[PDB]
Amino acid sequence: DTLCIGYHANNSTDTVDTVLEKNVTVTHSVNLLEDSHNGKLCRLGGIAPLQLGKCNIAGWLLGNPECDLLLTVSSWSYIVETPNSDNGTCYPGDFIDYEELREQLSSVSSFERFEIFPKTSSWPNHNTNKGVTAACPYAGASSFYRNLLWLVKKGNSYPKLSKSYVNNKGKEVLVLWGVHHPPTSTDQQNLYQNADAYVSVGSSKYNRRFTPEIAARPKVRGQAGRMNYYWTLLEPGDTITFEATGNLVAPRYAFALNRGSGSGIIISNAPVHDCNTKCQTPHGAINSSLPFQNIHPVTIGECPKYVKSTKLRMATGLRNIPAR
Amino acid sequence: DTLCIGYHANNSTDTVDTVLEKNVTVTHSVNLLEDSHNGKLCRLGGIAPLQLGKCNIAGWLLGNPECDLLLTVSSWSYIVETPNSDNGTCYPGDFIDYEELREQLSSVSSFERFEIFPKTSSWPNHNTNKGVTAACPYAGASSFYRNLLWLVKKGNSYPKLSKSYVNNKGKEVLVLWGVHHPPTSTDQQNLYQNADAYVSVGSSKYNRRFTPEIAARPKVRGQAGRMNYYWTLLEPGDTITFEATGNLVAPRYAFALNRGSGSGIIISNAPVHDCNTKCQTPHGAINSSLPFQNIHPVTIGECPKYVKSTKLRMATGLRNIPAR
Amino acid sequence: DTLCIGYHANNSTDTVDTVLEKNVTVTHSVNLLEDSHNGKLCRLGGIAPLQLGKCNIAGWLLGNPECDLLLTVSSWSYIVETPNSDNGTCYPGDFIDYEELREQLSSVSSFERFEIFPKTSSWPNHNTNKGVTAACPYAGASSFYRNLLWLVKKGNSYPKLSKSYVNNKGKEVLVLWGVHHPPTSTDQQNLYQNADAYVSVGSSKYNRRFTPEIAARPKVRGQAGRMNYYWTLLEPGDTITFEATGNLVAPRYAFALNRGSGSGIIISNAPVHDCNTKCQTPHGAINSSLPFQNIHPVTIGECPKYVKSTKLRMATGLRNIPAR
Amino acid sequence: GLFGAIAGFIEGGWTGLIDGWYGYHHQNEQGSGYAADQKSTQNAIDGITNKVNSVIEKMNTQFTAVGKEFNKLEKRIENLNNKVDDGFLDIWTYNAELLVLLENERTLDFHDSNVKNLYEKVRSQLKNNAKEIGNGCFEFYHKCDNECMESVRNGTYDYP
Amino acid sequence: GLFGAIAGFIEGGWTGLIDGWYGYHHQNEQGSGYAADQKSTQNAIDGITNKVNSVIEKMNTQFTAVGKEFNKLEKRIENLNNKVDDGFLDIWTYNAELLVLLENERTLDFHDSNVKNLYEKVRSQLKNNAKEIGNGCFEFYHKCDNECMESVRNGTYDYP
Amino acid sequence: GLFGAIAGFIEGGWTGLIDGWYGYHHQNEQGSGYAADQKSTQNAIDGITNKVNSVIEKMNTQFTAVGKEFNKLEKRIENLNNKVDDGFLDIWTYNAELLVLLENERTLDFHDSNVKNLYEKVRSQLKNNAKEIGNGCFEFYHKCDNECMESVRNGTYDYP
């Protein structure tokens, strides 16, 4: 009669590495690295992402004519830009503190767009219909940004304008505007009469003055002139005042922002899809319990810690010695 | 006759966790995590901290009327701001590179305040008594910053002024000043006569020109105008020159700084107290030999490495098996 | 007859530390920490480094008169500045976004210097020979930057100049220029006639206007006036246009850059030497296979991971018990 | 093996044993077969389970982490930001692999130690009533029947 | 136990022993009691002391570390700065807990190993002059008096 | 020693042995000397080699890493950049020393375990044909000649 003491073994092929030996077959192990995604852009918190498509944040906020599709969107789980998001500022110029605005939008889950300065009633003494350009076309015809209003002189007169807005939206209000710069003093006069105009913008915390900078610059989209874009976040209860004797591209629509942490902007060519997830990456959604993933470092929602690893298997059983 | 080999055991209740088993009672252990403080703001190096109280760095350096208490302080172990440090720039305006100045003050252990431009002798041709405002009150009456001098025209004349200072303090000298911006050209003339004034400041390394920006802005503390604040650190032996034809809020007092690493600014509501410590945190002082602490990440002096841990006990003895 | 089981031992004196015991003599070990260098600045990729010597990036790019030695250099493995690299902007002034330019040069392995605006043919209507100053001397005589051209009025006339350049170098082109600021309106007229001049620079993406800022500033190198320096990277195919009615220090030479990652600028007093290496540090070259080094954190090429360690020896053999 | 048991003095494993990691074979008159040692196998399962959970606990969850843009004159901070992202990325990848690498060694040794102990336990139970054949087998002297084998397993056996 | 001694073949501890971690009981004619093994206990104390000190050495002291302010147009660097603070905070918390967690295991095994070795040492000293009862006890054959017990302890005993 | 062998029940090393880390002495009639145990020594060399390589693998190569300049109004980012450089510098120095410190302990225990196992292996080979003297020596009963010793080494011996 005999009694032996031994240990388990099986047909497992699982392998793990150790300090002293590589490729050791084990009886049981757990993979800690997630490496699969559905290659689709899904919704988080049951809300679809905002697909800017051919437009970029600039084109969206300013209202580039090629972004009308986005006009009715006002809430999203995250913003998506693509490798072909080129429609931004159709009229050549500098967008001041643009990256900063993008950073700001990263914590905005939605807004209430409103006509801060109604077009048909806010400018009794200035023309509001000739503000179009071939640089910002729509349906082949000259047009302009949907959220700004290019004001020009009325009957050879551009009186000092003064327009203010008091914020009672109970939240931050994003106000955008522009300053135009004709290529010649002749154009400066055709558009605004006043040779030496200025634009002035101010609130309790914002204060800035702008001067036309007349000069011909290399043409871009047919324009030798330039148009600079500005923005500011007006606080609840504060007031913003615009004063100008020419060159002001006035705000038309503005946005009352709703903050809602846990969001951002991502660049992806992955297709949006009727689907849900708790974790989203530029390549597609992850659906896993594993502590790690090597899909992508950029992530949105509840996800596994990104890591450059190719393999991360932890041994649970023992060395497998079937000796068959 | 028998001889057995055994191990210690006792009434210890200490517990520690291990990779394989949680909550293991041990015979001896050492707690490595410090989690106690005296909830008081004490002095380091035998020097009291500078309690700005209701004022903030701006109010302190500019000399806001509500900060007279700080006037006689010129050395500290660290600066303290509270949740109620609101008295800063009583006159609405932008304080340029303010955060940077704060960063600069973080390595200043003391200074020698001096009247760089004596009020009663540096401005023979300009008025030095009408520079007050209801925005910076004191004892109910209109007043102004203690360390600046608001210069205005004298008998309907504001001659080009030119004032220079050569630094022989043998150390950096912090010079602060302002540029005023009336809301209307009428006020521009009442205050400075010259419609098109300018302020010019220069040293061997600093060089900047300022232009009045006239315009009515939303009122703040009753002011539709604005006042911008500037500063620069004049190097030993260098010279700073002020030239202006109006709108200059001249320096009155300046500071010769003494650097002394190992200090900073903290925000706290903990009360200052007649006490000493080698380690200070916004919640209170630490007095420990332990390698860690989970009191606060912000620290001043010699302190234990901050960590998010709740427990960090290291086993020294062995598993306690009293088997009573 | 006896048979014993034992272990190796020898005359080794190697020591290593362990969690439980310090200074343990071992039979075999490997040092993982490299701590030796040749104290020389050698070439990488078989290319010598650019030794700015007494000049700094500014002096080099602008062409300070004391840096003629660097004129014929156009390719390097890395740039070297010394504790005595003081020759930069000989004419007092501000060099805008200077650090940024330095950062840009860090990935430039070489360039093709060319005369963007030939001196003897680009300015028919302005003087091109009186642009020298005692602040930028050469051979005791007044001179100026080799890569810029200080234009002044011709026969009491300074017509509006307009000069453009189209980039076909098939790569980024670094264009540098300056804006002069006389100390008095008298000098403003002696130099440029026009009391109210302006300089304008533009491309598809760059757009900026400059105004003379007349004022006497503390003298530096004899100058009460100032000269600000600017630059921009003109993209392939783009065009840069200069327009001015005075005060423009025009570009003379520019640089077509060649990017070539894996390089940078270092500060060192180590001597350049006819030698090669795959790893370079400010103290000297490293030639090792070891995973670590404590020579210097700044490194260029293929090097061991820097670390603050003094010793890093790993035990391979066993505890050495010779018991002699 | 660090403890000389697994793949050591007990050369191989039993594909036959299928109720645990550690067990006995036994070849009595009444018959043969395999039987797993619950006591052992369970304490091991608990320990390993607690180990894997402890590892996962130490690693944090990745929440919203998106990029930032920088303009043409912010190359220095663009790089600083990049240096920080790669920085922590390399740190955590290092931590994850190194932790797993080191614990795999510890886990295997753990099993080796368990087999070893199960043996020594059984050994001191039988004492003189059997001899050590090798390969972790004990050849009895007093013919051990089925209920006798079981007594060795549950540690009751008891017989000087 | 990794070495099968503590909480293993020597089921419990002696609240009675109070001069060290490892010791002997002994029940001679002259009387009973407990006695700690200095040699063992001290080498352990030295090792553990050196261990704790080594851990503390690896962790650095926290000096002046205060925040920074950023204005409304510096949200990107404010976040970069925040990402760096949380970054290292999580790294060090990880390092501190993981180090302690892992060394606690090692420390317990260390003690287990020490008890185990003390036994085997005593065992090979007595050889035939006594038998292994279990629970780490040796029952003598040649009546071992008080000064005889002591000889076993200080490792002098010596008697084939 | 963690396994009680090296510097334990086998007090010292043999400067005489010079073909490996582990070996036998042997004192037969025909003569004495030393002989290294390839099987053992090699498996150890492989393991240690694999260990050192694995450590080096985990550490990355340092490529071009140069400083950045900041003007007088960029002290905040200059410091942020400095906090990041020192930050990772302290992390990696920590990782490097701590890794080496901990593996040195493991390596020494590894050797200790190997000596211990070589002994137990030899021991169970000789069984009754010799006695355990101590210091890891076996005194034979049946006079073991040179080719007899060799049989013990290559594990052939075999003789109940």
Ligand SMILES: CC(=O)N[C@@H]1[C@@H](O)[C@H](O)[C@@H](CO)O[C@@H]1O
């Ligand atoms: C309104 C506007 O911006 N127009 C252009 C359009 O002409 C161009 O084809 C497109 C893609 O290049 O970008 C913009 O949409």
Ligand SMILES: CC(=O)N[C@@H]1[C@@H](O)[C@H](O)[C@@H](CO)O[C@@H]1O
């Ligand atoms: C000199 C000055 O700044 N005065 C105001 C004071 O009137 C106000 O009550 C306080 C807090 O609201 O802020 C400032 O101290």
Ligand SMILES: CC(=O)N[C@@H]1[C@@H](O)[C@H](O)[C@@H](CO)O[C@@H]1O
């Ligand atoms: C300030 C404080 O509360 N610390 C005291 C310290 O002064 C004193 O020397 C020590 C003596 O036990 O106790 C605490 O450490």
Ligand SMILES: CC(=O)N[C@@H]1[C@@H](O)[C@H](O)[C@@H](CO)O[C@@H]1O
């Ligand atoms: C022209 C120029 O900027 N070079 C200067 C030179 O003028 C000066 O005399 C010397 C001493 O500091 O340093 C540089 O060589």
Ligand SMILES: CC(=O)N[C@@H]1[C@@H](O)[C@H](O)[C@@H](CO)O[C@@H]1O
């Ligand atoms: C050659 C020249 O320009 N002379 C100056 C000299 O007067 C001055 O003392 C020195 C240090 O600043 O720099 C230059 O050498």
Ligand SMILES: CC(=O)N[C@@H]1[C@@H](O)[C@H](O)[C@@H](CO)O[C@H]1O
């Ligand atoms: C037609 C027009 O509007 N101009 C360009 C056109 O040259 C280009 O082909 C097109 C597609 O990239 O993008 C437009 O912006």
Ligand SMILES: CC(=O)N[C@@H]1[C@@H](O)[C@H](O)[C@@H](CO)O[C@H]1O
């Ligand atoms: C998003 C997805 O496809 N993953 C699914 C999840 O939706 C579902 O709630 C869960 C239930 O077990 O199983 C996951 O695999």
Ligand SMILES: CC(=O)N[C@@H]1[C@@H](O)[C@H](O)[C@@H](CO)O[C@H]1O
């Ligand atoms: C009298 C005075 O100057 N202090 C006022 C105080 O009355 C008011 O409640 C507070 C509200 O913010 O603002 C302070 O400036």
Ligand SMILES: CC(=O)N[C@@H]1[C@@H](O)[C@H](O)[C@@H](CO)O[C@H]1O
């Ligand atoms: C720069 C130097 O002298 N070091 C050389 C190195 O270039 C060479 O790769 C190595 C092995 O070939 O030998 C070193 O001595």
